[PDB]
Amino acid sequence: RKNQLVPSLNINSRSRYFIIDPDTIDNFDDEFILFVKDYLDKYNSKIKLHTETPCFILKTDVNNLSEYHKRFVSRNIQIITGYIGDTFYFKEFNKEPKRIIKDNWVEFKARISCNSDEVIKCINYKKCDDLYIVGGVDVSLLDTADVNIENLEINNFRELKYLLSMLKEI
Protein backbone atom coordinates (compact mmCIF):
# COMPACT_ATOMS: atom_id res chain seq x y z
CA ARG A 1 0.00 0.00 0.00
CA LYS A 2 3.07 2.24 -0.11
CA ASN A 3 3.43 4.59 -3.13
CA GLN A 4 -0.37 4.98 -2.94
CA LEU A 5 -0.40 6.92 0.35
CA VAL A 6 2.77 8.82 -0.63
CA PRO A 7 0.91 11.48 -2.70
CA SER A 8 -1.35 12.17 0.29
CA LEU A 9 1.58 12.05 2.74
CA ASN A 10 3.63 14.69 0.88
CA ILE A 11 1.24 17.54 1.78
CA ASN A 12 2.48 19.84 4.53
CA SER A 13 -0.95 21.17 5.58
CA ARG A 14 -3.17 18.11 5.89
CA SER A 15 -5.34 16.84 8.74
CA ARG A 16 -4.76 13.15 9.50
CA TYR A 17 -7.02 11.22 11.89
CA PHE A 18 -5.97 7.74 13.03
CA ILE A 19 -8.31 5.15 14.54
CA ILE A 20 -6.36 2.40 16.28
CA ASP A 21 -7.43 -0.86 17.91
CA PRO A 22 -4.75 -1.49 20.58
CA ASP A 23 -5.29 -5.28 20.59
CA THR A 24 -4.24 -5.89 16.95
CA ILE A 25 -0.82 -4.20 16.70
CA ASP A 26 1.10 -6.67 18.91
CA ASN A 27 3.11 -4.80 21.61
CA PHE A 28 0.99 -1.66 21.42
CA ASP A 29 1.52 -0.54 25.02
CA ASP A 30 5.33 -0.53 24.84
CA GLU A 31 5.63 0.92 21.32
CA PHE A 32 2.77 3.41 20.83
CA ILE A 33 4.71 6.28 22.40
CA LEU A 34 7.77 5.63 20.22
CA PHE A 35 5.56 5.48 17.11
CA VAL A 36 3.95 8.80 18.02
CA LYS A 37 7.41 10.27 18.65
CA ASP A 38 8.68 9.15 15.23
CA TYR A 39 5.48 10.37 13.55
CA LEU A 40 5.48 13.86 15.13
CA ASP A 41 9.07 14.54 14.04
CA LYS A 42 8.44 14.07 10.29
CA TYR A 43 4.74 14.86 9.71
CA ASN A 44 4.44 17.62 12.34
CA SER A 45 7.76 19.42 12.85
CA LYS A 46 7.61 22.77 10.99
CA ILE A 47 5.84 25.59 12.82
CA LYS A 48 4.67 27.50 9.74
CA LEU A 49 4.17 24.68 7.22
CA HIS A 50 2.72 21.98 9.51
CA THR A 51 -0.37 23.84 10.73
CA GLU A 52 -2.80 20.97 11.44
CA THR A 53 -2.58 18.67 14.49
CA PRO A 54 -2.94 14.90 14.00
CA CYS A 55 -5.60 13.15 16.06
CA PHE A 56 -5.20 9.60 17.36
CA ILE A 57 -8.25 7.77 18.72
CA LEU A 58 -7.78 4.48 20.56
CA LYS A 59 -10.52 1.92 21.24
CA THR A 60 -10.22 1.74 25.03
CA ASP A 61 -11.88 2.92 28.22
CA VAL A 62 -11.16 6.32 29.75
CA ASN A 63 -9.09 4.83 32.58
CA ASN A 64 -6.28 3.57 30.32
CA LEU A 65 -5.86 7.03 28.77
CA SER A 66 -4.21 8.35 31.94
CA GLU A 67 -1.41 5.78 31.66
CA TYR A 68 -0.77 6.82 28.06
CA HIS A 69 -0.68 10.48 29.09
CA LYS A 70 1.77 9.66 31.89
CA ARG A 71 4.01 7.79 29.45
CA PHE A 72 3.86 10.73 27.03
CA VAL A 73 4.77 13.28 29.71
CA SER A 74 7.92 11.36 30.64
CA ARG A 75 9.03 11.59 26.99
CA ASN A 76 8.62 15.41 26.89
CA ILE A 77 5.78 15.25 24.35
CA GLN A 78 2.85 17.64 24.77
CA ILE A 79 -0.54 16.06 24.06
CA ILE A 80 -4.12 16.75 25.10
CA THR A 81 -6.97 14.32 25.73
CA GLY A 82 -10.02 16.42 26.59
CA TYR A 83 -10.68 14.27 29.66
CA ILE A 84 -10.20 15.58 33.19
CA GLY A 85 -10.72 12.48 35.31
CA ASP A 86 -13.86 10.93 33.82
CA THR A 87 -15.56 14.02 32.32
CA PHE A 88 -15.12 15.17 28.72
CA TYR A 89 -14.97 18.83 27.68
CA PHE A 90 -15.82 19.88 24.12
CA LYS A 91 -13.89 23.16 24.29
CA GLU A 92 -10.64 21.57 25.48
CA PHE A 93 -10.63 18.94 22.72
CA ASN A 94 -11.75 21.36 19.97
CA LYS A 95 -9.18 24.13 20.28
CA GLU A 96 -6.20 25.15 18.23
CA PRO A 97 -2.68 25.29 19.69
CA LYS A 98 -0.99 28.66 20.06
CA ARG A 99 2.22 29.08 18.06
CA ILE A 100 5.26 31.25 18.72
CA ILE A 101 7.31 31.04 15.52
CA LYS A 102 10.32 32.91 16.93
CA ASP A 103 10.69 30.27 19.67
CA ASN A 104 9.60 27.08 17.82
CA TRP A 105 6.94 26.54 20.50
CA VAL A 106 3.57 24.84 20.01
CA GLU A 107 1.12 24.24 22.86
CA PHE A 108 0.46 20.60 21.96
CA LYS A 109 1.46 18.42 19.03
CA ALA A 110 -1.13 15.61 19.09
CA ARG A 111 -4.70 14.82 20.10
CA ILE A 112 -5.20 11.45 21.81
CA SER A 113 -8.57 10.39 23.21
CA CYS A 114 -10.95 7.43 23.44
CA ASN A 115 -13.53 5.98 21.05
CA SER A 116 -16.47 7.46 22.95
CA ASP A 117 -19.70 8.93 21.60
CA GLU A 118 -18.68 12.41 22.76
CA VAL A 119 -15.33 12.26 20.95
CA ILE A 120 -16.94 11.00 17.73
CA LYS A 121 -19.25 14.03 17.80
CA CYS A 122 -16.19 16.28 18.11
CA ILE A 123 -14.58 14.54 15.13
CA ASN A 124 -17.78 15.03 13.14
CA TYR A 125 -17.82 18.72 14.10
CA LYS A 126 -14.36 19.38 12.60
CA LYS A 127 -13.83 17.01 9.69
CA CYS A 128 -10.39 15.91 8.49
CA ASP A 129 -8.94 15.21 5.05
CA ASP A 130 -7.60 11.67 5.57
CA LEU A 131 -9.00 9.09 8.00
CA TYR A 132 -6.89 6.02 8.77
CA ILE A 133 -8.44 2.90 10.32
CA VAL A 134 -6.20 0.25 11.90
CA GLY A 135 -7.58 -3.01 13.25
CA GLY A 136 -11.02 -2.68 11.67
CA VAL A 137 -12.53 -0.33 14.25
CA ASP A 138 -16.21 0.51 13.75
CA VAL A 139 -16.31 3.35 11.21
CA SER A 140 -20.04 3.92 11.73
CA LEU A 141 -21.40 6.99 13.59
CA LEU A 142 -18.69 9.02 11.80
CA ASP A 143 -19.71 11.12 8.81
CA THR A 144 -17.66 10.35 5.69
CA ALA A 145 -18.91 13.06 3.34
CA ASP A 146 -15.42 14.24 2.34
CA VAL A 147 -12.85 12.23 4.34
CA ASN A 148 -10.66 9.71 2.50
CA ILE A 149 -10.98 6.39 4.34
CA GLU A 150 -7.79 4.31 4.23
CA ASN A 151 -8.29 0.88 5.79
CA LEU A 152 -5.02 -0.53 7.13
CA GLU A 153 -4.51 -4.11 8.31
CA ILE A 154 -1.17 -4.69 10.06
CA ASN A 155 0.38 -6.82 12.79
CA ASN A 156 3.09 -4.62 14.35
CA PHE A 157 4.21 -1.00 14.28
CA ARG A 158 7.10 -1.86 11.95
CA GLU A 159 4.67 -2.29 9.06
CA LEU A 160 2.80 0.87 10.11
CA LYS A 161 6.00 2.92 9.85
CA TYR A 162 6.83 1.37 6.47
CA LEU A 163 3.37 2.14 5.07
CA LEU A 164 3.59 5.78 6.19
CA SER A 165 7.06 6.15 4.59
CA MET A 166 8.77 6.40 8.00
CA LEU A 167 11.03 3.38 7.33
CA LYS A 168 13.12 2.53 4.28
CA GLU A 169 12.85 -1.24 4.79
CA ILE A 170 11.31 -3.60 7.33
Binding site: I11, N12, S13, K48, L49, T51
Partner: protein
Protein backbone atom coordinates in the same frame (compact mmCIF):
# COMPACT_ATOMS: atom_id res chain seq x y z
CA UNK B 1 -11.55 33.01 -3.72
CA UNK B 2 -10.23 29.81 -5.27
CA UNK B 3 -6.72 31.31 -5.59
CA UNK B 4 -6.91 34.95 -4.53
CA UNK B 5 -7.82 38.51 -5.44
CA UNK B 6 -6.15 41.04 -7.71
CA UNK B 7 -4.05 43.84 -6.21
CA UNK B 8 -3.04 45.87 -9.28
CA UNK B 9 -4.62 46.05 -12.74
CA UNK B 10 -2.88 47.30 -15.88
CA UNK B 11 -3.60 46.72 -19.58
CA UNK B 12 -0.41 44.63 -19.83
CA UNK B 13 -0.12 43.09 -16.35
CA UNK B 14 -2.34 42.15 -13.41
CA UNK B 15 -0.99 41.42 -9.92
CA UNK B 16 -2.73 38.60 -8.04
CA UNK B 17 -2.31 37.93 -4.31
CA UNK B 18 -2.66 34.33 -3.15
CA UNK B 19 -4.96 33.81 -0.16
CA UNK B 20 -2.67 31.80 2.14
CA UNK B 21 0.12 29.23 1.92
CA UNK B 22 -2.06 26.10 1.96
CA UNK B 23 -3.96 26.99 -1.22
CA UNK B 24 -0.66 27.82 -2.93
CA UNK B 25 0.75 24.43 -1.91
CA UNK B 26 -2.41 22.65 -3.06
CA UNK B 27 -2.37 24.40 -6.46
CA UNK B 28 1.43 24.53 -6.80
CA UNK B 29 1.29 22.29 -9.87
CA UNK B 30 -1.00 24.67 -11.77
CA UNK B 31 0.84 27.85 -10.67
CA UNK B 32 3.74 27.90 -13.13
CA UNK B 33 4.94 30.23 -15.87
CA UNK B 34 2.98 29.72 -19.08
CA UNK B 35 -0.26 28.36 -17.60
CA UNK B 36 -3.70 29.96 -17.57
CA UNK B 37 -5.94 31.57 -14.94
CA UNK B 38 -9.33 33.28 -15.11
CA UNK B 39 -10.44 36.50 -13.39
CA UNK B 40 -14.13 37.24 -12.82
CA UNK B 41 -14.40 40.51 -14.70
CA UNK B 42 -17.91 41.75 -14.04
CA UNK B 43 -20.65 39.44 -12.82
CA UNK B 44 -20.58 37.02 -15.78
CA UNK B 45 -17.53 37.72 -17.94
CA UNK B 46 -14.07 36.22 -17.41
CA UNK B 47 -10.61 37.48 -18.35
CA UNK B 48 -8.13 34.75 -19.26
CA UNK B 49 -4.57 35.48 -18.16
CA UNK B 50 -1.19 33.77 -18.56
CA UNK B 51 1.23 33.57 -15.63
CA UNK B 52 4.51 35.43 -16.14
CA UNK B 53 6.13 35.59 -12.69
CA UNK B 54 5.65 34.18 -9.18
CA UNK B 55 7.11 35.57 -5.95
CA UNK B 56 6.64 34.07 -2.48
CA UNK B 57 8.39 35.61 0.53
CA UNK B 58 8.29 35.36 4.33
CA UNK B 59 10.86 38.00 5.30
Amino acid sequence: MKIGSVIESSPHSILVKIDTLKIFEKAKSALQIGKYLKIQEGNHNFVLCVIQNIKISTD
